[PDB]
Design a protein around this ligand. Sequence first.
Ligand SMILES: CC(C)Cn1ncc(Cl)c1C(=O)Nc1ccn2cc(-c3ccccc3)nc2n1
Ligand SMILES: [Mg+2]
Ligand SMILES: [Zn+2]
Length: 313
Amino acid sequence: GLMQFTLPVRLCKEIELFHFDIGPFENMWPGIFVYMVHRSCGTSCFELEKLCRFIMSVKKNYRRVPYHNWKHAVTVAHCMYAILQNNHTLFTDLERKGLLIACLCHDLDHRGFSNSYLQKFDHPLAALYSTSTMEQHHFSQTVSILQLEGHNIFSTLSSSEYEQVLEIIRKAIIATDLALYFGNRKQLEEMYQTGSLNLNNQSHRDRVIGLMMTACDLCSVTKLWPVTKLTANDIYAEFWAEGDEMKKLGIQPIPMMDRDKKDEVPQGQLGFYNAVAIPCYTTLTQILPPTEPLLKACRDNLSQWEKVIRGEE
Ligand SMILES: CC(C)Cn1ncc(Cl)c1C(=O)Nc1ccn2cc(-c3ccccc3)nc2n1
Ligand SMILES: [Mg+2]
Ligand SMILES: [Zn+2]
């Protein structure tokens, strides 16, 4: 009850900033996550014994893949923490609880392969879940871990609060399916401009939480350049392995996944910043003005990729 988590001075300060990096010390990531729950939610939201046991079971069910790993999980959870702390009063007690857990869990048991590769491989998961294949699996893995003995961090919620929080988490994880980002943002764009956006409209809130999840999930592009650039290597390490596996299936991968077309990466980053990242953080800032630092940081990194192409690095 009286057992707070504290961090060294530099982390205590830097963790409040959108562009915070959680560092290379794996054994501090759980403390960082608990620290963020205690300040975001209260020291009372979860039983510490249960939370800690949930955290370690979630860590166990992330795999040793280059990018979609335990570090990504905690990175995406921190970006959600930053958004929630900068938007203190827009979010219910349940939503703050559900979303940090949703982020920690959003990529559970990822193998480093796109929904596309699952379908072309004819993976059993593609039979069981036709759309948002990996994202339905991640939610399913979250519900499994929540049903382990001693792992129900939600136990003190009423039957109906409990169904609301599992429903917040399900939508939050499904929304990290980038194929659903485009329509989700176009709708949010129309609603904010025509002026119809209404945060008491649950179907509207859902879309806004959906965009937050895309924003947190993509937060690699909102770090300081050296973090962004070094994360790019891990993302491409997965992309190129998937390409190698596509060629094993007798399918020329798209250039993004073809390690022969490394040359074309800087241009590909540009596309993605222009087509996905900038529009995403633009719409997020329009709805949640205090999330502007994510837009600025993303713009700075777009400018860093333009420099790469021009031979200035
Ligand atoms: C991790 C991923 C699931 C979602 N994600 N999180 C952060 C970032 Cl960054 C991304 C992402 O998607 N990065 C992209 C997106 C589109 N691309 C296209 C090319 C490319 C390259 C060479 C030739 C041609 C094209 N490269 C791309 N890289
Ligand atoms: Mg994912
Ligand atoms: Zn992710």
